[PDB]
Amino acid sequence: GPSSPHSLETLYQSADCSDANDALIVLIHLLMLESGYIPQGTEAKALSMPEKWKLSGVYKLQYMHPLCEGSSATLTCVPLGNLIVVNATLKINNEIRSVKRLQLLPESFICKEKLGENVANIYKDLQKLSRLFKDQLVYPLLAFTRQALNLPDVF
Q1: Domains of the chain by start residue, with CATH
Q2: CA–CA distance from 27 to each of 17, 49, 123 (Å)?
């Protein structure tokens, strides 16, 4: 089989998810880590969710990237209806720029009726979410960031 991530397991445990929305954000965060992003608000990125990743009904995750020095990226995730809207934002030289808004449906990727079971049971269609999230957010964010910093394309 493919070996699962050690990190999702521990990150999910650290997250103390209360619903399907929390579970989706954990996976989103993991995908950012696997693409090289370094999160603020945690001492061991692979072991614990950032401090205040979940607050006031919204989610906030902040990162820097080793290939994007001179900037920071923020994901602001907001539940709207049955969807979660992921807003990607870039900060360079105290200027704030909007990069992407992505609509995600948790039910497509989370089995909410298996929330009280294992990580292997909670998430379904993992490669599908990874390809979607990377294709539609992570990679355009990196490209946008590289452009703004006047650097060559990473891919």
Answers
A1: 1-155 (3.40.1000.30)
A2: 11, 11, 9
